Curated annotation (Swiss-Prot):
GO terms for biological process: proteolysis. Its EC number is 3.4.21.4. The keyword Signal applies. This is Trypsin. Its main location: secreted. It comes from Fusarium oxysporum (Fusarium vascular wilt). Keywords: Disulfide bond, Hydrolase, Protease, Secreted, Serine protease, Signal, Zymogen. Belongs to the peptidase S1 family. The record marks 174 as: Required for specificity. It catalyses: Preferential cleavage: Arg-|-Xaa, Lys-|-Xaa. It is found in: Secreted. Residues 1-224 form the Peptidase S1 domain. It holds the Pfam family Trypsin.
Length: 224
């Protein structure tokens, strides 16, 4: 996360850190006791045995509850950067209680409103090309960027209705490498997307691109 601040215990009760080959890799959201929502690009085609999920901790290396994966369901039309969602089934159930809770999803057909505030969290880089990965969770608040402005930045066909954008025109606040799959929530803490892609991190006039839960609810509901 670029230009963020440390998350407080219980900020994101549903966030999970996803390690791969024992190293930092992605973020995710706990939907219920055995299901995690992440970005398809975090898991598509990789050996599932390499992954571990950690819930109930601000730290990606210790505390909370861990689980291996039982199965992975990547959106069937995942291609390029589009439809970048995957559902993970956990071999260890994670009960709600304490600092663990399940996400509340945006409504089917909802589209985040340009200008509204959204908060993204993760354990990713704190600068584009940055080396170090935080051990403790970071968060950042950015406004939603209209799809029109976003298409202005990336191209009309690069930004689909299965994506939404967020960022500051001047840059400096964004999701970065290792934040992929993690949550983006609205002002009410409703899960509206998953960190997906962008051009570098926190660049002026290059918004962060998020997989849209509202537009992909049929996929999510089929497998949650």
């Amino acid at each position: 996360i670029v230009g963020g601040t440390s998350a407080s215990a219980g900020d994101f009760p549903f966030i999970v850190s996803i390690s791969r080959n024992g190293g930092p890799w992605c973020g995710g959201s706990l939907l219920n006791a055995n299901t995690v929502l992440t970005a398809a690009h975090c898991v598509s085609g990789y050996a599932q045995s390499g992954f571990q999920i950690r819930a109930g901790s601000l730290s990606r290396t210790s505390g909370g509850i861990t689980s291996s994966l039982s199965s992975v369901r990547v959106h069937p039309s995942y291609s390029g950067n589009n439809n970048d969602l995957a559902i993970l089934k956990l071999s260890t159930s994670i009960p709600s209680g304490g600092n663990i809770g399940y996400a509340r999803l945006a409504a089917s057909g909802s589209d985040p409103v340009a200008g509204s505030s959204a908060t993204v969290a993760g354990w990713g880089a704190t600068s584009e090309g940055g080396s170090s990965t935080p051990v403790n969770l970071l968060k950042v608040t950015v406004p939603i960027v209209s799809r029109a402005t976003c298409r202005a930045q990336y191209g009309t066909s690069a930004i689909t209705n299965q994506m939404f954008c967020a960022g500051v025109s001047s840059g400096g606040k964004d999701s970065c490498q290792g934040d992929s799959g993690g949550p983006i929530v609205d002002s009410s803490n409703t899960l509206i997307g998953a960190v997906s892609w962008g051009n570098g991190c926190a660049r002026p006039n290059y918004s962060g691109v998020y997989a849209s839960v509202g537009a992909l609810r049929s996929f999510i509901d089929t497998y949650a």
